[PDB]
């Protein structure tokens, strides 16, 4: 049976997290996401200028072209990419998936190209939502989960601190207690779970539905749940310089927390105070607007008090504190 860790580690902020990879022989640094289901790497078929800083992937050198197949995916912050598809080796904590699908990215929108922090994406929602045409691929943790010692694997994502991805297996001293688990809606192909109420500071209220998302840096919540969450902040205003409500970086924070099937998961304060605004002497909140889609996200504000298993028998996913 094949299990691995990987080591994710943040860049300045906790704004992203990222894991090396190997493809076709080549380690690429990419952003592990929970919320997508496509592996796209930066590659030889960019603009010279733009395959600048990063580790490119080049598909002539190993991999194996899908002729006619095109992949091209758009995320909720705007950004997009597009290109083509070979099947290469990749491996992740040394479990390698053959016959992988890479989209090697042609086009980048603007976003991408600002970053150099990554080489792209590996995405780990279900198969069901990848954007390959005219056939969908299966995602790195589908294509090897029959070959893991268990079809699951887990994150422990930290503040300015190394963190991992555990594939196959569950190490339980990255958390205290049992793990409480909860079923998940997989309809819209991601790992979708419910809440049964929650509280924030001295105000309570009902639940709502939200999303595992390793790939989106706040926690994004109602609008109505923002305000309440704000009231609560001396002197918190809204920037749209920073993108959301700031605050002196000394105020004291409410805490955060969700009941899910009958475990509290508490966000302490001091993790939803992300970090400097670049605005000034104030800080932005972990916590923004989720611009009325529906549904929440649970982002890695929330991630990085939790250590989170995500089991594809069931669907389900477990909950315990980080140790
Ligand atoms: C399948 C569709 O699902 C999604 O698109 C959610 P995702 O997690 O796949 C995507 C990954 C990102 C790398 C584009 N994340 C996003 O699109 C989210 N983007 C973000 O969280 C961006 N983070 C920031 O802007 C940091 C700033 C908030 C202080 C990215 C740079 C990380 C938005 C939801 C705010
Ligand atoms: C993950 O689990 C596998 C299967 O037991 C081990 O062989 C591997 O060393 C790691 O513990
Ligand atoms: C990244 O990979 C393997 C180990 O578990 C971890 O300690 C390391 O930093």
Redesign the pocket.
């Known amino acids: 049976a094949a299990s691995g ?3 994710n580690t943040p860049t300045a902020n906790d704004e992203e997290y990222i894991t090396p990879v190997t493809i076709g022989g080549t380690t690429l640094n990419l952003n592990f996401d929970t919320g997508s289901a496509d592996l796209w790497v930066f590659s030889t078929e960019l603009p010279a200028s733009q395959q600048s800083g990063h580790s490119v992937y080049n598909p002539s050198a190993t991999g194996k072209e899908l002729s006619g197949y095109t992949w091209s995916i758009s995320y909720g912050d705007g950004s997009s990419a597009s290109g083509n598809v070979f099947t290469d080796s990749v491996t992740v ?1 040394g479990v390698t998936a053959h016959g992988q699908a890479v989209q090697a990215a042609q086009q980048i929108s603007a976003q991408f190209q600002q970053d150099t922090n990554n080489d792209g994406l590996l995405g780990l929602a279900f198969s069901s939502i990848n954007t390959v045409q005219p056939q969908s691929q299966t995602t790195f943790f589908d294509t090897v989960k029959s070959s893991l010692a268990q079809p699951l694997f887990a994150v422990a994502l930290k503040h300015q601190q ?1 963190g ?1 991805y555990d594939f196959g297996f569950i190490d339980s001293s990255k958390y205290t207690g049992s793990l409480t688990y909860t079923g998940v809606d997989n309809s819209q192909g991601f790992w979708s779970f419910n809440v049964d109420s929650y509280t924030a500071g001295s105000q309570s209220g009902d639940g709502f539905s939200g999303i595992a998302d390793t790939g989106t840096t706040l926690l994004l919540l109602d609008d109505s749940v923002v305000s309440q969450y704000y009231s609560q902040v001396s002197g918190a205003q809204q920037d749209s310089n920073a993108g959301g409500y700031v605050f002196d970086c000394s105020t004291n924070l409410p805490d955060f927390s969700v009941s899910i099937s009958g475990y509290t998961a508490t966000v302490p304060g001091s993790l939803i105070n992300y970090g400097p605004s670049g605005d000034g002497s104030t800080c932005l909140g972990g916590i923004q607007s989720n611009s009325g889609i529906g549904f929440s996200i649970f982002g890695d504000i929330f991630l990085k008090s939790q250590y989170v298993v995500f089991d594809s028998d069931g669907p389900q996913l477990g909950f315990a504190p980080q140790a």
Do not use: Q
């Open positions: 860790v990987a080591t904590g190394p991992v």
